[PDB]
Design a binder for this molecule. Structure first.
Ligand SMILES: *c1c2c(nc3cc(C(=O)N4CCN(C(=O)OCC)CC4)ccc13)CCCC2
Ligand SMILES: C[S@@+](CC[C@H](N)C(=O)[O-])C[C@H]1O[C@@H](n2cnc3c(N)ncnc32)[C@H](O)[C@@H]1O
Ligand SMILES: [Zn+2]
Ligand SMILES: [Zn+2]
Ligand SMILES: [Zn+2]
Length: 423
């Protein structure tokens, strides 16, 4: 028996609403993807199927683009990979955009796979396309994505007979733009992209009552507030460290709607997000583009050096509540944790603690993971009372955002038990 249901909203198309009263932390829906693929920057860094990062990966001898954590992952991914493997091969060294590879797996799964559990509440055919709202610029880009698809899928798709019935490629890419899910690993690293059509019923809110968390490619939908019967479920489409101006631009360009929630009407937290000298954080925001680019390709040393040049700069610095300063603090923490610089990592991680409490209110999985990382760094350095306080606070957040069903909760309990034995 399902706790959620599809329904027609008054001005937001279709949505999800509660069949029953929901409490914080209650699991609402699990789903594998209908189709998914590894991101461009994580390809060869994480297993193509399970999206876990490893020292070494074994590669597909046929294409050599697909790489895996183990022999089980390579053999199990073969059915969903066999048709794409050789549009991939015989197109080297020309790797297609992530969206084109994503749609290729959608077509193969819809053509050759059985009815997907991921389409139980909502199918790929039902997905919103927002076609009558697309600008001519966005249409032009979708036509370039269509011809890119046809060129990449030459060897396996000759004609409309090998596409689903009434399947239009322009509209399919329109659905991908506004229904794609970025997949983040346990450490909140962007590792993949996938489609979850039943989950794609959730409308956006800048202050949601639900949350998404990923266990590999598997998705868990949870309540993070109290929700009463008939109340619509919402998730935040966007990073929390965005101003209302940046949220307006992204919700327009990608999702074709104007948000008039309370937070956007009052520019909630905008001023605190941009404290400090404007010229200083405009450079940091400009430099974050390359910093985040290097992080997407797991080049941690380059991330740290650029972040150190900002955090320990000889020129004027920013307060830690400035979102662009905060992002540099986060990138530097992840770079240090992963180069083994654990005292420098804790220095940056502890600094993000108070800004994260303000910008991730209630129960947000991003804060719970950040707090868990800080508590894990404190425990590894013998700061047992300080570590316990954060590890418990991480459990108070992540037990609502992450599940009994999420593997990271098991890892947190071990750290809690270990820290408890020490105390
Ligand atoms: C990766 C990372 C961060 N947060 C994430 C949040 C989610 C998220 O729950 N999600 C984004 C995709 N989305 C959507 O586009 O709705 C319209 C279809 C649903 C909501 C995904 C991945 C995330 C935090 C920083 C670390 C990376
Ligand atoms: C992932 S789909 C959500 C389900 C969608 N309403 C449907 O019927 O399939 C995202 C699309 O829903 C609409 N939408 C989502 N959140 C909205 C909101 N808060 N206000 C207005 N429209 C919204 C936008 O058109 C967006 O392109
Ligand atoms: Zn694997
Ligand atoms: Zn292959
Ligand atoms: Zn809003």
């Amino acid at each position: 028996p399902l706790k959620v249901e599809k329904f027609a909203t008054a001005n937001r198309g279709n949505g999800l609403r509660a069949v029953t009263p929901l409490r914080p932390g209650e699991l609402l829906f699990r789903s594998d993807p209908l189709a998914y693929t590894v991101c461009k920057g994580s390809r060869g860094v994480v297993c193509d199927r399970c999206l876990l990062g490893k020292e070494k990966l074994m590669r597909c001898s046929q294409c050599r683009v697909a790489k895996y954590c183990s022999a089980k992952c390579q053999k199990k991914a073969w059915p969903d990979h066999k048709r794409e493997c050789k549009c991939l091969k015989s197109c080297k060294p020309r790797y297609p955009p992530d969206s084109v590879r994503l749609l290729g797996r959608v077509v193969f799964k819809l053509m050759d796979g059985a009815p997907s559990e991921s389409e139980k509440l909502y199918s790929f055919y039902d997905l919103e396309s927002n076609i009558n709202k697309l600008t001519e610029d966005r249409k032009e880009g979708l036509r370039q994505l269509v011809m890119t698809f046809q060129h990449f899928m030459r060897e396996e798709i000759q004609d409309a007979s090998q596409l689903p019935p009434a399947f239009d490629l322009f509209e399919a890419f329109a659905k991908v733009i506004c229904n794609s899910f970025t997949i983040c690993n346990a450490e909140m690293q962007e590792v993949g992209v996938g489609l979850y059509p039943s989950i794609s019923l959730l409308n956006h809110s800048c202050d949601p009552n639900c949350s998404i968390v990923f266990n590999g490619p598997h998705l868990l939908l949870r309540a993070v507030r109290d929700i009463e019967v008939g109340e619509e479920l919402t998730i935040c489409y966007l990073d929390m460290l965005m101003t209302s101006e940046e949220r307006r631009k992204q919700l327009r360009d990608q999702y074709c709607f104007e948000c008039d929630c309370f937070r956007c009407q009052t520019q909630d937290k905008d001023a605190d997000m941009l404290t400090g000298d404007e010229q200083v954080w405009k450079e940091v925001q400009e430099s974050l583009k390359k910093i985040e680019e290097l992080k997407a390709h797991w080049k941690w040393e380059q991330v740290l050096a650029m972040c150190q040049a900002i955090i320990s700069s000889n020129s004027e610095r920013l307060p830690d509540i400035n979102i662009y300063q905060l992002k540099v603090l986060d990138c530097a923490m992840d770079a240090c944790i992963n180069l083994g610089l654990l005292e420098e990592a804790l220095f940056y991680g502890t600094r993000t603690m108070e800004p994260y409490r303000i910008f991730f209110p209630g129960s947000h999985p991003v804060r719970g993971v950040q707090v868990m990382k800080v508590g894990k760094l404190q425990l590894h350095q013998g700061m047992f009372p300080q570590a316990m306080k954060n590890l418990r606070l991480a459990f108070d957040i992540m037990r609502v955002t992450h599940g009994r069903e999420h593997s990271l909760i098991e890892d947190l309990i071990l750290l809690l038990e270990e820290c408890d034995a020490n105390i």
